[PDB]
Amino acid sequence: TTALVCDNGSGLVKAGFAGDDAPRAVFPSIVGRPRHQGVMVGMGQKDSYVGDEAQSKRGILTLKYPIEHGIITNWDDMEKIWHHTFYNELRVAPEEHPTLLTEAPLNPKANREKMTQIMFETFNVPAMYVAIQAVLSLYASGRTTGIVLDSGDGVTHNVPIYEGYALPHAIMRLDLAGRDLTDYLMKILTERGYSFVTTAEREIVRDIKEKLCYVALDFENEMATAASSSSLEKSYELPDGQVITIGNERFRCPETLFQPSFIGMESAGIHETTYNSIMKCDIDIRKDLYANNVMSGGTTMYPGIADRMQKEITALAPSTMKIKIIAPPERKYSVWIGGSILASLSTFQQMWITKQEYDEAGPSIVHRKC
Amino acid sequence: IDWGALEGETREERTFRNWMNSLGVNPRVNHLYSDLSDALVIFQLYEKIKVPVDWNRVNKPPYPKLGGNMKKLENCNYAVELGKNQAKFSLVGIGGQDLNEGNRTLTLALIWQLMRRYTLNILEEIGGGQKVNDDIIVNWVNETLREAEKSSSISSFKDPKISTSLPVLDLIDAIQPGSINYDLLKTENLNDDEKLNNAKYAISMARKIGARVYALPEDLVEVNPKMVMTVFACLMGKGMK
Amino acid sequence: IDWGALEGETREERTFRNWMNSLGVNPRVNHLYSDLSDALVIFQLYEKIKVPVDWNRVNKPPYPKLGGNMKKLENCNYAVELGKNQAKFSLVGIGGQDLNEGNRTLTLALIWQLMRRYTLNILEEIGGGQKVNDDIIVNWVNETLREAEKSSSISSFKDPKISTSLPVLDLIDAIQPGSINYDLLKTENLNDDEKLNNAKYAISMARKIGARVYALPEDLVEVNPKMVMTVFACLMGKGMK
Ligand SMILES: Nc1ncnc2c1ncn2[C@@H]1O[C@H](COP(=O)(O)OP(=O)(O)O)[C@@H](O)[C@H]1O
Ligand SMILES: [Mg+2]
């Protein structure tokens, strides 16, 4: 009766029932493996740790996210993550529960085909549907007209919509996300002597990212200020009681989104691709799109993004032209909340892909009806 | 029969420990995550879902300080092997550590599947075959209540009559004689406490006859389909034919 | 009964909301285009023009913020489907958007046809058959007023006697006894306010007996054929035979 729903981001994995407001299952998309020789008897006998357990035992492990840039690459590890989600976390069977899924736009068709195969064959799910992560943000916002700028773990796509109809020729997809920022921060910290190279240490770098970094409203004034003073510096304690001191790196890193040439990546940047995705759209529509820009995803949670974007795109756009931004606290969940709204509605009793239909056509359904 | 909330527990936890305590378990469980570490209880459970146990391999209770954890881990590892291989459970990220260490998640991750398997073995046992469903059971319960002339029919497992549990007691009296006191049969059962009185009463007495009820009064007074169906199912249970 | 012009409304708007409020509607309409967005009122209206409603499909009032608009649109879409298919309305350029968005045109575009259908169902109900017309009704009203010896005949629905509404009150007293105060029966009813007094009075009391009058004093004090005919029609209404 009640459907399940999970976004399956390339970083975090989020799940829960239909109709709820917030999830009860948050673990990262991890599969860990040991990399040492075991000596004690009884211990061992666990080829794989998954999720938060693997994160806690990361000291002895190699941790591998199977997903990269919204694409699945390692299907066995992925299968195990699915099992963990359904059984160990959600405490429920698949066979008598319809399920919903999402993915970034402009993914390979094979990914959808594999997900359908896995469900209907392995898990024997009664019914299924796939969605676009951007669209659900609008349902969560209770709107129709706006641009959804999802900037997640491994991908950053941009979708304009007007009155329930999408303009697919204007879609844009980037490869920047919080992951490249993690690596870039790690690369900087060399400059102050701190050297973090391993996987678990990368998780520490992520913990620094989501606690100390912010956005500069003006990058150069901020930089010259940091150079002339230590008032901007902050310290952070590592797990071993060590202390790391950080200065300009707090804002030097997320500026990468607005100057990707730091990482040797020729591209437009966020402030520019948002504009270009509107210039493709028809002229009469551009207004409500400027005035209903929406954000989503966890990398949108730095302090100072929204103010910066308004200090940005405004300069690119005409005068006498309202730039509005929408960036609520419920980000990192608007996708999933939209999914929960979706599965509760009545209409979808048609929309679901069903088992008998897959038994007839095969995986091509998801591209037939989608 | 000391029902009551423990020192920061959850509504599912009490259901699972009541499942266990109602199921004839030899050491009284105060609370799960400290009593299941030796796993002996789960070894008692496998047999009840018709899954053999090699008691020779099962270490007896760890009495030595020195042996201690290692014996417990041998037990827990073999328990997880029983889960995965023979009885066909999904325990992808689980091993003996998580049981002995009292991980709050994965313990339950085994337990709810065990519970489902016992329920399913039952559901096979009622109707000779594979499964049953609300059709046959609602048919036969309404036939039974029709015979005793006592009270009204089950039109669904969402019927608010079960909020009082009076259909349940009408039924317990329908299958077997008046081995039961009716002064608690009190209409206008509107006080929550009174619905709970009749409900504790019904559960206790279904267990008295031998019907293998594990329910809570909070699960009848509030109508809950899977759970209430299970109550009636295990009343199909001990005596049909 | 707070009659009065709203914050920039139109003469038709007040007629339609008074149609609604006089028709026993559960939430008091302050004004149309903000209260009809959930469409529940129109679902109440279909039944009154003898058009079924599948209340299972009808979403209950949108309490969640998150559901919100989507539930309203499901409701509005089903309402428009009822309009087009079963009840045979013309809604060529209409969908759920226009109802939920409060488009000032198309809302009314549904409403006036609903109003006409209710009126027509009535017109069938008076004379067993298909329709009626001014012939039969003017015949019978003049017969009735002849019986009570009170006052003059209706020669047309343009008769200036109705500017005072005294034929209407003579009539309300003709069908049923003197359950009504005559000190307001005041000839030389030349002040517009006094015609309005007698008119508010007549409307209120036709509703008191049960005659399903939706009119305005401004529609009797100023004679208006379709509308005044409707007043007399719904007085045929509750008790003829
Ligand atoms: N306070 C914060 N500031 C900046 N970044 C954050 C913060 N909290 C989480 N993040 C980042 O946001 C990402 C989570 O975004 P999310 O929408 O869950 O990705 P996905 O859509 O792929 O699940 C994480 O990868 C993390 O690095
Ligand atoms: Mg994402």
Numbering used by the authors:
A (entry chain H): 7 to 376
B (entry chain h), C (entry chain d): 385 to 625
Original authors' sentences:
The domain structure of PLS3 encompasses the N-terminal Ca2+-binding regulatory domain (RD) and a core consisting of two actin-binding domains (ABD1 and ABD2). RD contains two EF-hands and a calmodulin-binding motif (CBM), whereas each ABD is assembled from two tandem calponin-homology (t-CH) domains. Binding of Ca2+ ions by EF-hands potently inhibits F-actin bundling, but has only a marginal effect on F-actin binding by all human isoforms, suggesting that only one of the ABD’s binding to actin is inhibited. Plastins are well recognized to stabilize parallel aligned F-actin bundles.
